[PDB]
Amino acid sequence: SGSCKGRCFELQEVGPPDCRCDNLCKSYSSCCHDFDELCLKTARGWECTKDRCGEVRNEENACHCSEDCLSRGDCCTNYQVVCKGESHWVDDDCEEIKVPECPAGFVRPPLIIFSVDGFRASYMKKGSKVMPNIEKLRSCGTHAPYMRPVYPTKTFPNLYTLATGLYPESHGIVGNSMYDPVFDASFHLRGREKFNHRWWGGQPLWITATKQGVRAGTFFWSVSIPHERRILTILQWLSLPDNERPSVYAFYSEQPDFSGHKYGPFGPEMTNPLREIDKTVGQLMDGLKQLRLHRCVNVIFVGDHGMEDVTCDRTEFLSNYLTNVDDITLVPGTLGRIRAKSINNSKYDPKTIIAALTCKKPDQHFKPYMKQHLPKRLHYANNRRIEDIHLLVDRRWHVARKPLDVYKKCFFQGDHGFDNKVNSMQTVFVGYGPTFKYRTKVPPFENIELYNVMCDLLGLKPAPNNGTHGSLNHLLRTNTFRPTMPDEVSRPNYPGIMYLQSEFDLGCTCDDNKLEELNKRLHTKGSTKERHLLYGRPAVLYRTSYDILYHTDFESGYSEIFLMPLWTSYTISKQAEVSSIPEHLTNCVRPDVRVSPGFSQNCLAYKNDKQMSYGFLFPPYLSSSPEAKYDAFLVTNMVPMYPAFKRVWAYFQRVLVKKYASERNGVNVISGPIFDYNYDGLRDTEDEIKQYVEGSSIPVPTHYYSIITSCLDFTQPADKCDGPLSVSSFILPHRPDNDESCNSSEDESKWVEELMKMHTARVRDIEHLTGLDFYRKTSRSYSEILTLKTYLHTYESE
Ligand SMILES: *[C@@H]1O[C@H](CO)[C@@H](O[C@@H]2O[C@H](CO)[C@@H](O[C@@H]3O[C@H](CO[C@H]4O[C@H](CO)[C@@H](O)[C@H](O[C@H]5O[C@H](CO)[C@@H](O)[C@H](O)[C@@H]5O[C@H]5O[C@H](CO)[C@@H](O)[C@H](O)[C@@H]5O)[C@@H]4O)[C@@H](O)[C@H](O[C@H]4O[C@H](CO)[C@@H](O)[C@H](O)[C@@H]4O[C@H]4O[C@H](CO)[C@@H](O)[C@H](O)[C@@H]4O)[C@@H]3O)[C@H](O)[C@H]2NC(C)=O)[C@H](O)[C@H]1NC(C)=O
Ligand SMILES: Cc1cc(OCc2n[nH]c(=O)n2C)c(-c2cc(C(=O)N3CCN(C)C(=O)C3)ccc2F)cc1Cl
Ligand SMILES: [Ca+2]
Ligand SMILES: [Ca+2]
Ligand SMILES: [Cl-]
Ligand SMILES: [K+]
Ligand code: NA
Ligand SMILES: [Zn+2]
């Protein structure tokens, strides 16, 4: 019954039953009676024409061509072009913006986030001819060839990750559809529940801004508000007095995604939606230019995810695998999440569901996982809203429970939601404005990094998040964030020879000159350490007790608590040779006379444990000499490994490391165990360990990592590199079977590398999982090193 007069798109939202004129009033059925009439004017459309110039202001018109419109801030965006003989922003040469050029009274450059739904990364190249405004932003500002979304590659998880800097498992929007068993409530795209505040965790940019005195415009736009009105509203807000004007704004377009679903990512129908988005960008930039804000505002052009070809004939049906299909609830589509239809069903067994879904058809287009066994790079486990059973669906496919679900609801030709390394899921980033660099291309990066940068652009302190603050400094002309390396918490001991062989009772056996004798002592004292520890030792960022152990071919930081290395570091040159394990050493394990029997593993435990065997972190295959090979059989280089995993590990060590050393001109490798029994992506304390080698205190890792570093300029060997580095890493699941690899009965050359690629990782992922900090001593700037630590090698083509 109240009125919207003078309150159109009010930023502060009024408490019902007072009627609301804020954006979200439509989404709640609560708009004042005159909302449409006052706030959604459309009369005479969206452009000035020659005859409208200098008209008398008519308040019914969608936008204005009257002389007073600029001061009022509500001209049609083409007003100066049509009426004052100005040029469209897109027709102007670009000129470097070295400093903000803002009207007096602006305390900081405003930020406009221009978000576009389903804008696949390759549209920047493929649609360049039909998008001149976007192409000007891209070539004049700072751009990446693509930006990596989070998993699942759906809208709300990705947009709320942009808003918060958090993985979906931490912010809580883990899908477009969710069941929370604590609330016993469901979240759906359609409907009311999704507005409840208890779904949305972390602290989004608009709250961060507000808490720190920076005003924010709306981020969420009702679908029925036309795009032109969203633009004109932003432009209106920017004309507000200093004390009311927001400093951060978002625009959102549901295109190209909406058409992409109907026509496929490159259907011929897709050209028009791309033209329309470009026209809207043009309206914004012309509107900014009229307000003399086009060299003041920082603009971010960003997508949430891309779009893949998906049709309803590419659907896998669980009813083809499960006899019990009606006892489960499936969240379906480009991912699958399974739980019991009824929690009173005591018969429901997830292990047998997984078994029935595992490698059952030769070209099966989905793979089942317990969530803790998903590639750690997905960070998709630590939330009660993520079901225990997950299906990773092949790109281009869908999963559904029963054929009825798909034909009782081939309309669509496009979908998204797949693994976030899939090329078709990649999206876009362009930054344009005084705070961004000029004509600069930056490498691809993950959208979890953007919240920190948007905070930097606004002078805000970011809430704790999953970005690595400083890793995106190379996008910025100024306002860079200059972090300090975390302080080492535990200093190592450097044990010398302290124990006689006969003090060890380990059930371990091994069939075991003064020039060469001073020689071996110097190696044990760290004489080759500069060859094998190229970037300094890792820093231990938690309280523990550990020892540095030096050897000819490798150095290790040995944990007295976990009875194995936290890390083992070694360098393999291009010329290095692979040798075999000599017969007299096949089951040799040697006591390490620097490390007490009581802080050592023992062979008897492995003998007793019928499921568990052991491997080595530094591979004996790569020893530099027959004498150095004995070091690789030290009990302090041994780690527990299931026989099934040893097939993976042996192939990596015997074949792949040497191959990488040939291809990259030497590699430095750091390997070690990871313990993440509660799947939170973070280092377990010793009291979280769920499994031990039978009858011992030897803890069983959930994963094994390796970080493989070389020179980015591969004409320089890894050990003599002058400039930037190149890295690939993995976090391999330490599993007692190879059920994840359907071809594992074949030779390791047909399936191990594929497994490793699936479990590619960032160094930063390994850092969270181990509590270590790598690359402490390089000649590189720290921000460059933070970019390196966030790098992910995806193994996708161009
Ligand atoms: C990515 O970045 C994020 C952000 O930095 C990292 O997440 C942080 O991880 C921290 C370490 O795990 C975690 O710290 C805990 O916080 C507890 C207090 O939490 C509340 O308050 C904060 C601050 O405002 C808030 O952010 C939290 O929000 C979470 O929970 C709500 C409601 O459930 C959600 O809406 C929201 O989405 C978010 O959920 C996520 O986090 C929780 C865990 O906090 C998950 O369970 C969810 O699945 C989801 O992922 C909260 O509202 C605090 O109580 C904890 O302290 C316990 O542990 C310490 C150890 O030092 C112990 O000393 C304390 O006494 C306490 O133990 C007691 O409780 C134990 C558990 O119940 C019990 O076992 C003991 O016996 C003790 O009595 C802890 O400090 C921090 O909350 C999150 N923050 C966020 C936003 O997620 C994340 O790790 C990064 N990821 C990676 C891979 O790096
Ligand atoms: C660029 C961007 C755009 C955003 O939305 C654009 C949009 N408009 N219309 C439409 O369908 N979409 C997708 C969002 C976004 C904001 C909210 C919100 O605003 N929230 C959440 C908590 N709840 C409970 C709130 O009160 C506020 C919710 C979901 C979001 F995706 C975030 C960013 Cl960073
Ligand atoms: Ca979307
Ligand atoms: Ca953990
Ligand atoms: Cl979902
Ligand atoms: K055994
Ligand atoms: Na297998
Ligand atoms: Zn979509």
mmCIF file of N, CA, C and O in Angstrom, residues 7 45 88 128 182 197 395 457 497 532 548 587 596 707 746 748 759:
data_model
loop_
_atom_site.group_PDB
_atom_site.id
_atom_site.type_symbol
_atom_site.label_atom_id
_atom_site.label_comp_id
_atom_site.label_asym_id
_atom_site.label_seq_id
_atom_site.Cartn_x
_atom_site.Cartn_y
_atom_site.Cartn_z
ATOM 1 N N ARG A 7 12.226 6.329 -4.006
ATOM 2 C CA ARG A 7 12.945 5.235 -3.340
ATOM 3 C C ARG A 7 13.334 4.094 -4.286
ATOM 4 O O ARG A 7 13.552 2.968 -3.815
ATOM 5 N N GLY A 45 11.726 3.676 -25.069
ATOM 6 C CA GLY A 45 12.919 2.838 -25.192
ATOM 7 C C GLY A 45 14.200 3.394 -24.559
ATOM 8 O O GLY A 45 14.174 4.219 -23.613
ATOM 9 N N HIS A 88 31.194 7.167 -29.588
ATOM 10 C CA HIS A 88 31.055 5.976 -28.730
ATOM 11 C C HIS A 88 32.416 5.628 -28.113
ATOM 12 O O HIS A 88 33.472 5.800 -28.732
ATOM 13 N N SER A 128 35.125 -12.610 -31.356
ATOM 14 C CA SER A 128 35.775 -11.279 -31.406
ATOM 15 C C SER A 128 35.163 -10.303 -32.412
ATOM 16 O O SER A 128 34.994 -9.119 -32.092
ATOM 17 N N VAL A 182 21.398 -31.397 8.625
ATOM 18 C CA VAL A 182 21.313 -30.824 9.965
ATOM 19 C C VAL A 182 20.048 -29.974 10.101
ATOM 20 O O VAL A 182 19.346 -30.030 11.122
ATOM 21 N N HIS A 197 19.305 -17.114 4.995
ATOM 22 C CA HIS A 197 20.712 -16.794 5.277
ATOM 23 C C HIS A 197 21.613 -17.964 5.728
ATOM 24 O O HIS A 197 22.833 -17.948 5.488
ATOM 25 N N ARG A 395 32.873 -35.216 -19.608
ATOM 26 C CA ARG A 395 32.387 -34.043 -20.348
ATOM 27 C C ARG A 395 31.480 -34.539 -21.479
ATOM 28 O O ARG A 395 31.780 -35.580 -22.091
ATOM 29 N N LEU A 457 41.485 -3.700 -4.689
ATOM 30 C CA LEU A 457 41.010 -2.598 -5.525
ATOM 31 C C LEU A 457 40.178 -1.601 -4.721
ATOM 32 O O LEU A 457 40.012 -0.472 -5.159
ATOM 33 N N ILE A 497 75.970 -39.323 13.862
ATOM 34 C CA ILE A 497 75.937 -40.764 14.108
ATOM 35 C C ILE A 497 75.892 -41.001 15.617
ATOM 36 O O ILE A 497 76.844 -40.644 16.292
ATOM 37 N N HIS A 532 70.622 -30.825 -4.332
ATOM 38 C CA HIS A 532 69.336 -31.497 -4.127
ATOM 39 C C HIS A 532 68.276 -30.677 -3.431
ATOM 40 O O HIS A 532 67.107 -31.001 -3.541
ATOM 41 N N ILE A 548 66.834 -33.004 10.034
ATOM 42 C CA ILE A 548 67.307 -32.986 8.643
ATOM 43 C C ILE A 548 68.351 -34.080 8.454
ATOM 44 O O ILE A 548 69.314 -34.125 9.215
ATOM 45 N N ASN A 587 65.185 -56.900 -0.458
ATOM 46 C CA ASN A 587 64.359 -56.718 0.734
ATOM 47 C C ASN A 587 65.214 -56.155 1.865
ATOM 48 O O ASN A 587 64.949 -56.314 3.055
ATOM 49 N N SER A 596 67.178 -42.771 16.377
ATOM 50 C CA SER A 596 67.005 -43.824 17.379
ATOM 51 C C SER A 596 66.086 -44.942 16.876
ATOM 52 O O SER A 596 65.169 -44.692 16.079
ATOM 53 N N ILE A 707 56.350 -32.720 -5.975
ATOM 54 C CA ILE A 707 56.455 -31.416 -6.591
ATOM 55 C C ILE A 707 57.672 -31.475 -7.509
ATOM 56 O O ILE A 707 58.796 -31.778 -7.048
ATOM 57 N N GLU A 746 46.066 -53.912 -17.232
ATOM 58 C CA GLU A 746 47.093 -53.712 -18.242
ATOM 59 C C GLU A 746 48.411 -53.165 -17.671
ATOM 60 O O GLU A 746 48.504 -52.844 -16.475
ATOM 61 N N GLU A 748 51.433 -50.731 -16.647
ATOM 62 C CA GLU A 748 51.341 -49.389 -16.018
ATOM 63 C C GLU A 748 51.468 -48.246 -17.053
ATOM 64 O O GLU A 748 50.911 -47.155 -16.861
ATOM 65 N N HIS A 759 44.978 -36.438 -10.821
ATOM 66 C CA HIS A 759 45.332 -35.993 -9.459
ATOM 67 C C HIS A 759 46.465 -34.938 -9.430
ATOM 68 O O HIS A 759 47.181 -34.765 -8.424
#
